[PDB]
Amino acid sequence: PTREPQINLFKKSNPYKAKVISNVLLTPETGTGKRPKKEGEALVHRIVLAIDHSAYPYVIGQSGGVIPPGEDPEKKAKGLADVGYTVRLYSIASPSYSFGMKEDNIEFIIKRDNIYNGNIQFKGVCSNYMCDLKPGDEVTMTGPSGKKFLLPNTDFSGDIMFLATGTGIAPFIGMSEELLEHKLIKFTGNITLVYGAPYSDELVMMDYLKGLESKHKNFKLITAISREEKNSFDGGRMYISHRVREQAEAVKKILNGGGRFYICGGPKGMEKGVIEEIQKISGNTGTYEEFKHHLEGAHQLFVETY
Numbered sequence: 145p146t147r148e149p150q151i152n153l154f155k156k157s158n159p160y161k162a163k164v165i166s167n168v169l170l171t172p173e174t175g176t177g178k179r180p181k182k183e184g185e186a187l188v189h190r191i192v193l194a195i196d197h198s199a200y201p202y203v204i205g206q207s208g209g210v211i212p213p214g215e216d217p218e219k220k221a222k223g224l225a226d227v228g229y230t231v232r233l234y235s236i237a238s239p240s241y242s243f244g245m246k247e248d249n250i251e252f253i254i255k256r257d258n259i260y261n262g263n264i265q266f267k268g269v270c271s272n273y274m275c276d277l278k279p280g281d282e283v284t285m286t287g288p289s290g291k292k293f294l295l296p297n298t299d300f301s302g303d304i305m306f307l308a309t310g311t312g313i314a315p316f317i318g319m320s321e322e323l324l325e326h327k328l329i330k331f332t333g334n335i336t337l338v339y340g341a342p343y344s345d346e347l348v349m350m351d352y353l354k355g356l357e358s359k360h361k362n363f364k365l366i367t368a369i370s371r372e373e374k375n376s377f378d379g380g381r382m383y384i385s386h387r388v389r390e391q392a393e394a395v396k397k398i399l400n401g402g403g404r405f406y407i408c409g410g411p412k413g414m415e416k417g418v419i420e421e422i423q424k425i426s427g428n429t430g431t432y433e434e435f436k437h438h439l440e441g442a443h444q445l446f447v448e449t450y
């Protein structure tokens with residue numbers, strides 16, 4: 145809620161207690177779905193927490209921090225006096241004011257983060273804790289966090305490209321709802337959401353995303369399914385970067401027309417492949433770092449990869 149991003153309103157020393165409204169599995173149950181056996185699990189949940197929007201006045205594009213319960217064995221073993229698990233950040237998935245502008249909740253799209261043969265080797269603490277949440281459970285929350293990855297706060301005529309891998313869809317759920325529905329700003333640009341996931345059933349919120357596309361004309365949904373689609377350029381796996389290339393004219397509308405690219409998801413540093421594809425499109429032959437900083441300087445690139 146309320147515009148103007150605030151950060152670190154809540155920290156480990158003064159956390160925010162949020163109650164679980166819902167935590168539903170978005171992807172097929174393990175063993176079901178396209179992902180084989182080897183190739184681990186892909187268990188992604190939409191977590192809806194009840195929050196006081198006056199206490200937690202988050203902006204879409206920000207992260208919510210979660211402190212998972214318990215002692216961290218690495219910290220006990222290192223003899224820290226800290227010992228509590230460190231915050232894990234999760235992109236907020238819900239629009240600033242919540243769906244329906246109800247100001248009642250916060251949402252997260254959280255993958256089970258495990259290693260995996262296909263059988264579990266190492267279990268992610270916070271992602272699993274979060275995906276294990278039952279209605280009415282209390283989440284220790286931190287933040288809000290981040291003040292870069294944000295939507296325009298004034299009227300915007302520029303085109304916006306949302307570039308997502310997996311859970312990186314999160315900010316763009318809320319961002320798209322906000323831009324198309326909430327109209328906190330007048331948005332007269334085109335949204336292109338490029339959403340990458342390994343399997344079609346590992347893409348989440350698709351009914352909702354396709355629905356936005358059919359309701360608007362303002363909104364284009366493109367998916368890149370890396371283990372089911374080959375790209376036309378080299379026949380390799382389809383990634384959002386290949387979709388970006390396919391969408392050269394839309395990318396050029398953004399490059400030339402003051403629009404924005406938002407890149408969110410994994411793995412860490414995946415924006416590089418995307419940006420350098422945007423760079424090929426622009427015809428710029430400077431260093432990756434020159435082009436990216438230029439774009440960020442121009443407010444035309446926002447990256448949150450992890």
Ligand SMILES: Cc1cc2nc3c(=O)[nH]c(=O)nc-3n(C[C@H](O)[C@H](O)[C@H](O)COP(=O)(O)OP(=O)(O)OC[C@H]3O[C@@H](n4cnc5c(N)ncnc54)[C@H](O)[C@@H]3O)c2cc1C
Nearest residue numbers: 233234235254255257258259266267268269270271311450
């Ligand atoms: C700004 C930002 C936004 C984010 N947004 C989202 C989001 O929207 N949705 C989302 O799902 N995630 C998001 N993430 C990632 C999230 O914050 C966590 O990092 C993620 O959930 C994994 O945390 P974890 O506590 O579950 O795993 P951790 O316990 O911290 O470990 C990470 C990985 O290491 C493995 N591991 C554990 N022990 C070992 C060991 N012994 N040796 C080798 N490997 C080991 C685990 O299996 C796991 O796969 C975001 C991250 C950032 C920084």
Ligand SMILES: [Zn+2]
Nearest residue numbers: 324325359360
């Ligand atoms: Zn609408």
